[PDB]
């Protein structure tokens, strides 16, 4: 059975608890994903210094929590529906959302042209001594291509953590190497749900390295660092808007996946734009872009971001799922454990931009019954940041999003 | 810039 | 025999007369054309100082020294005696030590070859010379030939005796054409009559695009402070980037803005708000200007420069005369026997007119705006040097490899 081709009934969804048409459904989900994206980004932004970098794949995070939702129940299940906005999809049963998410993934990673590389790989890691519910296992593999791999958490938390991080590294051409922090997984860890996404496109209009020059970049509080600024001249869908904010779209070969840069007018702060960000605000801009001859200056760079998702998500609505008391994930383990709750969830993203094109990768790991690690951190605030989006146009999906502030690498 | 002279 | 690749021996000048320039007191280019470039500039600067001095501080000024040097160098071909000498002195051709007046022309052809390379370049720099004589007169064969061989000037016969006006309309049409319509009615109605036998004309036309773009989106209205102590609204172009710059004497700022191709650029001289431009002009010596140019160093700065159109026209007779060119204009003293054959050897220049045009803006086009600029990930030094041209300043458009001043002027009022 191939879900991509299959129809609603052809796939026996048997979720334990509960709370063109396939195309308009998929779309509505893309909107739901977008909603979660900009909202999560704002919360994430409030936890960081306006001059720090921020990179993440909302899609990855949405996928890992959808996967997790397959065993959710009660409020836990409901809260999951609302926090990720799946509850805005014209449906009735919380279980139907999964079918369309599969449809989306299908269109996102399965195409003939493949002008640009965009792959995804999901997987589950359960303790070698437990008996996992068979429906949950079979449905996760079917809907999300996520097989359940055995791991000895009880006797080898570390072996396992390294094992998972390595599996992630393999699916991210080695750009994501430590999604899971050192002590995040312990003897009580029951399961770790993981998502990975890897992208690599070529500029439809590449830059000449001959036109790339070094340029002193001044960090807000401090001195400078050399930066490689690329230079190109040509026609691009562009648009200067309110308060002098510029919106520039850089399409990759194929035009199905593009990179949108957003920058405030010089001396005007970016924080104001972020606080007004919204799927519609963004759509508004995207609709106002016009073909125009322009000169584009843009740095050659790479940024890496990593963090816990627990904090942000709780503030957004996900409370139960992380509570050892209120969490309700009955549909996962059939026999072996019964008090399942998410101890933490980590994400890690990578973005590199050069003359040939761009490369991005991400991963989300939802750790069940592990040790809740205290929020990590790596501050190096820079200056004058611009927003970035790597989206798939036909599917209206924000694959990656972020704020580039330190073009010094 | 465009300039001419005669 | 192509003059651009010819050896001096392949081009016989057979001049009617000769003058020996008295005894005096790099970079992979030709020694002689380099010296001629220096000469043209000495004339350029000097003549500009004179012209500006006779002009009110609130007036814009624009002209082409190269155009003038070329025309008179063309006229020198038939000059003799004191007319020949003065020509060599005023236009500083005599400062190319121990070189004879006829050798100047060979060097001038070589300078023109480089200048109007016409190669697969980006900026357009063209030139056109032409002699308009009366159909009834019989011009010197050597004069005719050399004017063509060295300066590419053909000899088109006109009927000044019967149809002077029709002849004037012909000349004007030619110049308008050679200047993409920017230079019209060069020759005044009054001028050109039944006694007119020769009208020598040189045209220079240039159009380039900025190598560093001035996005129209960033242009805004700002006050310009004229010499009369008043202000006016100007269109200010704005950008930040690296340009060859240098802070010289008494806080005067010198900035070079290159056009696509790097071969030609625009140099601006902006005195500190305190110092009046008249002073900088009075001190702008040929050797001083040269020092400044050599001191330019690439540097990150902010540029504030207005859009503007300048149209200047004037007679060169008076200025040139105060500078030493007298005989040429004297019906009694002029010596131009090498121009018209058989008699009429007491031929003199009745008048000499210059007309120049200059337009500066973002895209180079007078149309609306169709371009923009996006600079992502830039954070410059908060203490970067700033160049704000909201007061009178000097302007030059030069050919760097040769160090030739093609045009020059003063922007005393860019307002509308
Ligand atoms: C094996 C087990 O624990 N029993 C339940 C079963 O009652 C339910 O029908 C199914 C649907 O998700 O989930 C589990 O299999
Ligand atoms: C000016 C010129 O063409 N040169 C010749 C000159 O060599 C010769 O001596 C003279 C007749 O005596 O005829 C011309 O002037
Ligand atoms: C002052 C004058 O008119 N006489 C001389 C003439 O004798 C001489 O042959 C000629 C050659 O250049 O130079 C002048 O014309
Ligand atoms: C809070 C709780 O455990 N009670 C309900 C239970 O009454 C119901 O039969 C079951 C079916 O999904 O869902 C549970 O959430
Ligand atoms: C290029 C342009 O538009 N300028 C025209 C040219 O097309 C025409 O050939 C010439 C007369 O021959 O007159 C010029 O003014
Ligand atoms: C046609 C004529 O008048 N003859 C003279 C000739 O004697 C002189 O040698 C030559 C050099 O310029 O110029 C010619 O015009």
């Amino acid at each position: 059975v191939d879900i991509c081709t299959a129809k609603p009934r052809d796939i026996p969804m048997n979720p334990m608890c509960i709370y063109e048409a396939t195309n308009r459904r998929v779309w509505e989900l893309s909107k739901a994903n977008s909603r979660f994206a900009t909202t999560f980004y704002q919360h994430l932004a409030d936890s960081k210094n306006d001059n720090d970098n921020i990179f993440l794949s909302p899609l990855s995070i949405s996928t890992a929590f959808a996967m997790t939702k397959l065993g959710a129940c009660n409020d836990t299940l409901q809260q999951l529906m609302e926090v990720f906005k799946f509850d805005t999809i014209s449906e009735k049963t919380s279980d139907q959302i999964h079918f369309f998410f599969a449809k989306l993934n299908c269109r996102l990673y399965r195409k003939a042209n493949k002008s640009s590389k965009l792959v995804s790989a999901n997987r589950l890691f359960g303790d070698k001594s437990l008996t996992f519910n068979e429906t949950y296992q079979d449905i996760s593999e079917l809907v999300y291509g996520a097989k359940l791999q055995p791991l000895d958490f009880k006797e080898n938390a570390e072996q396992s953590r390294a094992a998972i991080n390595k599996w992630v590294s393999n699916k991210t051409e080695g750009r994501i190497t430590d999604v899971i922090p050192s002590e995040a997984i312990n003897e009580l860890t029951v399961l770790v749900l993981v998502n990975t996404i890897y992208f690599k496109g070529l500029w439809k209009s590449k830059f000449s390295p001959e036109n790339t020059r070094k340029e002193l970049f001044y960090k807000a509080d401090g001195e400078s660092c050399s930066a490689s600024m690329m230079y190109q001249e040509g026609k691009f869908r562009y648009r200067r808007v309110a308060e002098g904010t510029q919106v520039l779209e850089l399409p990759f070969k194929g035009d199905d996946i593009t990179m949108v840069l957003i920058l405030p007018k010089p001396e005007k702060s970016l924080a104001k734009v972020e606080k007004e960000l919204t799927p519609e605000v963004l759509q508004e801009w995207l609709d106002e872009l016009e073909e125009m001859m322009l000169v584009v200056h843009m740095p050659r760079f790479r940024i890496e971001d990593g963090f816990s998702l627990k904090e942000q998500l709780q503030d957004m609505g996900l409370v139960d799922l992380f509570s050892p008391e209120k969490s309700k994930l009955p549909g996962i383990v059939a026999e072996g454990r019964d008090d399942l709750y998410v101890s933490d969830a980590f994400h890690k993203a990578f973005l590199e931009v050069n003359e040939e094109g761009s490369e991005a990768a991400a991963s989300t790991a939802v750790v069940i019954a592990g040790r809740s690690l205290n929020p990590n951190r790596v501050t190096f605030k820079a200056n004058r940041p611009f927003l970035v989006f790597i989206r798939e146009v036909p599917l209206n999906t924000i694959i990656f999003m972020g704020r580039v502030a330190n073009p010094c690498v | 810039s465009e300039a001419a002279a005669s």
Side-chain angles (χ1 to χ4, degrees), chain A, chain B:
Chain A
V1 177
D2 182 304
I3 307 189
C4 297
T5 57
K7 294 193 170 183
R9 294 183 177 180
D10 299 300
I11 301 304
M13 287 286 296
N14 195 56
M16 199 173 280
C17 318
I18 292 184
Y19 165 96
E20 308 66 58
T22 295
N23 296 302
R24 71 186 188 185
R25 209 97 314 180
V26 170
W27 185 73
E28 303 171 82
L29 166 65
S30 80
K31 287 171 57 185
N33 294 333
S34 283
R35 300 270 177 60
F36 175 72
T38 58
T39 306
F40 182 77
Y41 180 79
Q42 302 179 298
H43 286 272
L44 192 62
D46 297 312
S47 66
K48 292 202 178 188
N49 173 290
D50 299 61
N51 281 306
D52 280 309
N53 290 321
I54 302 185
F55 198 60
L56 66 312
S57 169
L59 189 60
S60 172
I61 304 167
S62 278
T63 305
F65 281 90
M67 281 166 62
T68 298
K69 196 189 63 67
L70 282 179
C73 195
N74 309 184
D75 297 325
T76 304
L77 169 48
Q78 181 183 305
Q79 285 175 41
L80 284 172
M81 288 280 93
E82 314 169 319
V83 178
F84 293 78
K85 307 306 297 180
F86 299 139
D87 75 337
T88 74
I89 300 178
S90 60
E91 254 302 303
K92 279 193 175 182
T93 54
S94 68
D95 66 77
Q96 280 304 297
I97 189 283
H98 300 281
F99 179 67
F100 311 117
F101 210 145
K103 289 300 175 184
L104 173 54
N105 288 22
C106 283
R107 302 179 196 173
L108 280 168
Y109 321 103
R110 300 189 184 186
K111 290 184 295 184
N113 298 178
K114 296 190 302 179
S115 48
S116 297
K117 182 180 190 184
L118 181 59
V119 301
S120 183
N122 304 305
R123 173 161 294 202
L124 309 173
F125 303 78
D127 184 60
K128 194 157 181 291
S129 76
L130 303 167
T131 295
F132 288 95
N133 181 299
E134 287 189 299
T135 51
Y136 164 70
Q137 195 175 324
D138 293 312
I139 197 178
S140 292
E141 178 168 4
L142 172 73
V143 180
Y144 296 110
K147 290 179 179 172
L148 201 157
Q149 181 183 302
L151 244 56
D152 177 16
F153 295 129
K154 282 181 178 165
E155 241 69 64
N156 287 281
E158 268 302 300
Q159 285 282 301
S160 300
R161 190 181 72 79
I164 304 172
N165 290 335
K166 211 203 70 175
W167 182 80
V168 175
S169 179
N170 264 292
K171 298 300 170 180
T172 61
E173 296 311 308
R175 290 330 218 301
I176 303 297
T177 109
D178 207 295
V179 211
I180 303 170
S182 55
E183 298 111 58
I185 299 179
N186 66 24
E187 326 70 53
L188 305 179
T189 307
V190 167
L191 179 74
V192 179
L193 306 86
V194 184
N195 169 81
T196 62
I197 299 174
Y198 182 86
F199 162 75
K200 197 175 176 185
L202 297 170
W203 290 131
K204 182 176 177 180
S205 299
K206 293 191 176 182
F207 300 84
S208 288
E210 33 271 298
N211 299 296
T212 295
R213 280 69 201 302
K214 252 69 179 181
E215 163 170 334
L216 263 53
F217 177 95
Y218 294 65
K219 304 171 185 170
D221 283 303
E223 73 293 68
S224 306
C225 38
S226 181
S228 302
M229 305 300 291
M230 299 185 283
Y231 181 98
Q232 182 184 319
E233 183 164 356
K235 298 184 72 293
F236 294 82
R237 296 198 61 237
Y238 159 83
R239 186 53 160 243
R240 177 170 167 295
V241 308
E243 307 202 45
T245 289
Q246 292 183 296
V247 178
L248 175 64
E249 177 168 65
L250 307 181
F252 291 99
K253 282 184 171 183
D255 289 80
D256 57 342
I257 295 177
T258 72
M259 179 185 272
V260 175
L261 314 187
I262 296 175
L263 23 175
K265 81 194 302 179
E267 207 170 307
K268 199 70 177 183
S269 179
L270 183 56
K272 307 173 184 178
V273 186
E274 301 179 310
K275 294 184 174 61
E276 306 165 300
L277 186 55
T278 294
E280 14 288 327
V281 174
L282 179 68
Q283 183 49 44
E284 181 172 346
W285 292 338
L286 284 178
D287 290 329
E288 302 187 310
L289 302 174
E290 291 293 303
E291 284 280 304
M292 183 158 273
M293 259 294 305
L294 67 262
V295 174
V296 167
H297 296 61
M298 172 184 220
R300 274 173 45 77
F301 72 103
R302 101 152 56 155
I303 58 169
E304 301 190 60
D305 199 10
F307 48 91
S308 162
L309 299 192
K310 197 163 65 171
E311 326 84 296
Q312 337 310 329
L313 293 180
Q314 307 190 90
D315 295 324
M316 293 186 57
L318 267 209
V319 187
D320 286 30
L321 185 54
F322 307 90
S323 166
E325 298 68 55
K326 313 175 196 171
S327 187
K328 297 284 167 287
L329 304 160
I332 293 172
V333 181
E335 295 170 55
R337 232 71 107 195
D338 243 304
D339 301 309
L340 271 49
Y341 70 91
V342 178
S343 64
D344 227 310
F346 312 87
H347 187 74
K348 212 172 180 180
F350 167 114
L351 174 60
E352 180 159 287
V353 177
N354 57 34
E355 294 89 325
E356 293 69 58
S358 197
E359 209 200 322
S363 178
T364 306
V366 176
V367 178
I368 300 302
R371 161 165 48 271
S372 176
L373 274 185
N374 192 296
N376 315 175
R377 59 195 321 302
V378 180
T379 302
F380 284 82
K381 56 178 179 180
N383 218 179
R384 295 185 179 180
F386 50 99
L387 303 179
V388 194
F389 300 78
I390 296 182
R391 77 173 196 302
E392 205 272 358
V393 187
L395 304 166
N396 185 65
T397 292
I398 300 175
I399 306 172
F400 295 94
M401 79 185 289
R403 171 216 292 160
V404 176
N406 192 162
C408 275
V409 305
Chain B
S1 296
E2 179 180 28
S6 183

